[PDB]
């Protein structure tokens with residue numbers, strides 16, 4: 276389906292204009308970046324045996340995904356600010372996020388997200404394990420503090436939520452429990468969540484995990500496999516629009532749902548205030 280749609284989109288500008296015609300209006304963007312140690316080896320097949328966070332003259336998958344998403348959504352972001360957080364490094368493990376800048380100051384445009392990402396990366400100690408509860412909870416706080424303005428949270432990660440050793444017997448890990456609880460609680464706010472998978476994964480159990488999230492007032496969550504889309508045999512500019520559309524085409528209907536449910540522009544009043552850690556850098 277997304278392939279069939281993207282065949283007719285030759286540029287990200289075309290995608291942006293389509294999002295607008297589909298009803299997307301003022302829209303804010305939050306970015307969360309996975310700094311787990313697994314990034315060192317999840318590029319075995321997908322990134323020529325280099326770390327997914329490897330910095331060079333060519334953009335790694337994080338930089339690629341940020342660029343495509345940022346360029347597609349830039350026109351809708353009236354103040355051009357992008358709250359950006361890391362998680363999964365040694366300073367946060369699966370418990371916290373850190374802000375890209377001290378005092379939680381937001382990036383000014385996706386270009387600054389990219390620049391600051393490159394500044395931060397070599398200074399980090401990569402760790403784990405993997406939970407998306409802290410980053411989703413951070414996004415909830417930002418939405419609440421904005422007085423209910425519509426946000427899209429884009430999480431870019433190289434693995435599924437950490438599973439229980441006893442997953443085969445139907446048991447959930449604390450990471451899974453908290454992450455699912457956060458996705459559900461997030462649906463009480465005007466917030467859309469996009470989990471972008473980069474690297475080798477594996478990702479086969481992710482879309483099953485997504486399918487089994489408890490029923491919510493609106494479908495506020497999607498998984499998109501960047502690796503799989505980019506590994507396809509077609510034009511790069513077409514793979515890029517297919518990724519953009521796969522990630523974002525569901526955003527305008529979700530936005531419309533936040534209006535229908537009257538979530539837009541109001542405070543929920545029951546959102547714990549998560550505090551981001553400072554960036555663990557010089």
Ligand SMILES: [Mg+2]
Pocket residue numbers: 309311312313314405433434
């Ligand atoms: Mg990982």
Ligand code: NA
Pocket residue numbers: 302303304352353354355356357
């Ligand atoms: Na904004």
